[PDB]
């Protein structure tokens, strides 16, 4: 039923102020904040030959927040000049229940990654800046990521033009686009 | 903060360069000492002012798309206003209690 | 979203949001007049 | 607490007649009505489902269950998990009924899920382990009841999903 319009964003590692101040100023929110979490992709597909990803992104800096998981894949060919995303389906989880259910039903951890950066929001949009590290479980590619994403029901792709205009607003700093 | 002072100094330097060029032209065309050095300094200052103007014009262009920095901490302003009003009401009540006590004694 | 892990039947599902506006000011004024009346009754019983 | 549900197979008059008799006894006890809290838990495969009231469909399949997925989270996940679990042939039904609240208490009657089933009673407690008061109240309700089998030797600290585990055990038992 629901859908998504997640757009990919990649800025140089040194260009940080021109992004943080512009996003804090143009139109995001009042009183911004940050975050920290690590993702755990999984896959359980024996004969179907379609590994379904289950990102159990748990916020390590959160006070027992649920392991909000999302399923994304199979980008729909809409050709609406949008972020070229697919339908999304969020799913909350309990404390250590994601790993528990992954072990019960049977899953294979494809990889593990951690993220850390600042947070931003919008009206019907959402942009996030963070940095990915490559380290063991106890604790980088030198490239930040602007996570301009939209998650909403199908509707009529009205938010696509708004997201395109918002990206054109931040054109002097970055240049968002789709991905394969 | 510093960009404002930079632009102000650039404008003052452009004015001083114009004045120095005028004075150098006057001293050189009056009769024929330091006119050569004066003209060299005037040309150098004019070039420096032009370079500073070009650099200031070639700024990062923060937004140029909409009204930026929306929201001037109005919540904090209202909170401070309410705190001041609370202090004023407390002062008025304290003065009333003091008047009552003075009328008592 | 806390209703996911800690599934509350009807407590938090109703406590997540409630009405406000004029009812709150009305309740506050009712409490004010009630406290005033109670204090006046106590003072009158003391003076009597 | 988490009081497990039993399956008293009453007979003589009728199943609906026995349910009405239990409801009349509960009303004579002095319990008011508090809406119809129809619980629903459908098995699947060794998956499961849950609609126990609460906008969170928390399918405790195994390993004590997560019991955290939203009312639409686990449902959309199972709908999208087509071809992964191909044991949807054996369906599963669910009971319903009323829900009274005498005082810090709750009672739920488990009617016929698909049509063959007994009147499954179910109760709760106020704080929580603390079975003296629970049994003292249950004995005044009917006769043969209170099987038990809680999460003993745990201290969990009043496990809320224990009710779901008891419901799943009862549904598998009938």
UniProtKB/Swiss-Prot annotation, chain A:
Residue numbers bearing the Phosphoserine modification: 50
A Pfam cross-reference name: Med18
Disulfide bonds: none
GO molecular function terms noted in the UniProt entry: transcription coregulator activity
Alphabetized UniProt keyword annotations: Activator, Nucleus, Phosphoprotein, Transcription, Transcription regulation
Places the protein is found: Nucleus
CC terms in the record's Gene Ontology section: core mediator complex; mediator complex; nucleoplasm; nucleus
InterPro entries: Mediator_Med18 (IPR019095)
One example of a Gene Ontology biological process annotation: positive regulation of transcription initiation by RNA polymerase II
Coiled coil: none
Purpose: Component of the Mediator complex, a coactivator involved in the regulated transcription of nearly all RNA polymerase II-dependent genes. Mediator functions as a bridge to convey information from gene-specific regulatory proteins to the basal RNA polymerase II transcription machinery. Mediator is recruited to promoters by direct interactions with regulatory proteins and serves as a scaffold for the assembly of a functional preinitiation complex with RNA polymerase II and the general transcription factors.
Protein family: Belongs to the Mediator complex subunit 18 family.
Name listed for the protein in its UniProt record: Mediator of RNA polymerase II transcription subunit 18
Swiss-Prot record, chain B:
Pfam families: Med11 (PF10280)
Keyword Cell cycle: no
Tissue specificity as recorded in UniProt: Expressed in cochlea.
GO CC terms of this entry: core mediator complex; mediator complex; nucleoplasm; nucleus; ubiquitin ligase complex
The UniProt record lists the keyword Transcription regulation: yes
Subcellular location: Nucleus
An example Gene Ontology molecular-function term: ubiquitin protein ligase activity
One GO BP: positive regulation of transcription initiation by RNA polymerase II
Broad class of where this protein is predominantly found: nucleus
Keywords: Acetylation, Activator, Nucleus, Transcription, Transcription regulation
Gene3D superfamilies linked to this entry: 1.10.287.3490
Family, similarity comment: Belongs to the Mediator complex subunit 11 family.
Quaternary structure note: Component of the Mediator complex, which is composed of MED1, MED4, MED6, MED7, MED8, MED9, MED10, MED11, MED12, MED13, MED13L, MED14, MED15, MED16, MED17, MED18, MED19, MED20, MED21, MED22, MED23, MED24, MED25, MED26, MED27, MED29, MED30, MED31, CCNC, CDK8 and CDC2L6/CDK11. The MED12, MED13, CCNC and CDK8 subunits form a distinct module termed the CDK8 module. Mediator containing the CDK8 module is less active than Mediator lacking this module in supporting transcriptional activation.
Protein name listed in UniProt: Mediator of RNA polymerase II transcription subunit 11
Organism: Mus musculus (Mouse)
Chain's gene name: Med11
Curated annotation (Swiss-Prot), chain C:
Location(s) in or outside the cell: Nucleus
Disulphides: none
Subunit (UniProt): Component of the Mediator complex, which is composed of MED1, MED4, MED6, MED7, MED8, MED9, MED10, MED11, MED12, MED13, MED13L, MED14, MED15, MED16, MED17, MED18, MED19, MED20, MED21, MED22, MED23, MED24, MED25, MED26, MED27, MED29, MED30, MED31, CCNC, CDK8 and CDC2L6/CDK11. The MED12, MED13, CCNC and CDK8 subunits form a distinct module termed the CDK8 module. Mediator containing the CDK8 module is less active than Mediator lacking this module in supporting transcriptional activation.
Family: Belongs to the Mediator complex subunit 17 family.
Biological role stated in the UniProt entry: Component of the Mediator complex, a coactivator involved in the regulated transcription of nearly all RNA polymerase II-dependent genes. Mediator functions as a bridge to convey information from gene-specific regulatory proteins to the basal RNA polymerase II transcription machinery. Mediator is recruited to promoters by direct interactions with regulatory proteins and serves as a scaffold for the assembly of a functional preinitiation complex with RNA polymerase II and the general transcription factors.
Protein name: Mediator of RNA polymerase II transcription subunit 17
Originating species: Mus musculus (Mouse)
First and last residues shown, out of full length: 404 to 451 of 649
From Swiss-Prot, chain D:
Signal peptide as annotated in the record: none
Designated gene of the protein: Med20
Subunit organization: Component of the Mediator complex, which is composed of MED1, MED4, MED6, MED7, MED8, MED9, MED10, MED11, MED12, MED13, MED13L, MED14, MED15, MED16, MED17, MED18, MED19, MED20, MED21, MED22, MED23, MED24, MED25, MED26, MED27, MED29, MED30, MED31, CCNC, CDK8 and CDC2L6/CDK11. The MED12, MED13, CCNC and CDK8 subunits form a distinct module termed the CDK8 module. Mediator containing the CDK8 module is less active than Mediator lacking this module in supporting transcriptional activation.
Family to which the UniProt record says this protein belongs: Belongs to the Mediator complex subunit 20 family.
Pfam families the record matches: Med20
Alphabetized InterPro entries for the sequence: Mediator_Med20 (IPR013921)
This protein's name: Mediator of RNA polymerase II transcription subunit 20
Chief location of this protein within or outside the cell: nucleus
Annotated localization: Nucleus
